[PDB]
Design a protein around this ligand. Structure first.
Ligand SMILES: [Cl-]
Ligand SMILES: [Cl-]
Ligand SMILES: [Cl-]
Ligand SMILES: [Cl-]
Lengths: 122, 122
């Protein structure tokens, strides 16, 4: 169900899928941060949530995207909820444009997401 | 009133200003496209409206930002309304992150916006 499907469709349908999956999402900001493993950010611009739990998620999942001043609120909530936030500017930007929320990460972001998650695992 | 104010504030207040000016904007998509001189786009990702009218606008103004599938609708409306759309990927991305709607363009985008407007003037 959470498959990104790189080889299926067109750039136009990928854009429709991104908007649709964003719009159908039911969670509020705190719910989205609390269900994430880590947040990657471009400070003052973008925050992307990532969920990865071995045996539950076959691949990392993008849980949310927030922009501009919402990033300040995301950082406050993450501190309250004990969710680590990392500065990863090119990764956050690439996931912003290309990733679908509530779907596995795009193939192009595997290397960079794995680097973040090696850090998270320690 | 439409001053970007590069030297004033902080990156955090600029992010609050971007969100606020986006939220207070009253126009619908057709109204926003119709009042623009040109649209710059990253197809399937970003469309930014620019207004520049000699003697009325001291500098080009950003009129709107639309993303993902909304870009398809922007392109359809622009054709209906006779507003030219250009593919300018780095300019569209830079205005997306940094520009404030209903304010003059950021100083960093002067060179690239002027290039677009030389084209528009012909
Ligand atoms: Cl996938
Ligand atoms: Cl490492
Ligand atoms: Cl200005
Ligand atoms: Cl030229």
């Amino acid at each position: 169900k959470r498959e990104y499907k790189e080889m299926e469709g067109s750039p136009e349908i990928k854009s429709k899928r991104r908007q649709f999956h964003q719009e159908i999402q039911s969670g509020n900001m705190r719910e989205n941060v609390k269900r994430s493993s880590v947040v990657v950010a471009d400070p003052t611009h973008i925050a992307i949530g990532i969920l990865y739990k071995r045996g539950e998620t076959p691949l990392p999942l993008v849980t949310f995207k927030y922009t501009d001043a919402q990033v300040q609120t995301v950082r406050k909530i993450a501190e309250e909820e004990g969710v680590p936030i990392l500065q990863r500017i090119p990764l956050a930007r690439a996931l912003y444009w290309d990733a679908l929320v509530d779907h596995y990460i795009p193939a192009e972001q595997i290397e960079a997401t794995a680097e973040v998650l090696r850090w998270l695992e320690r």
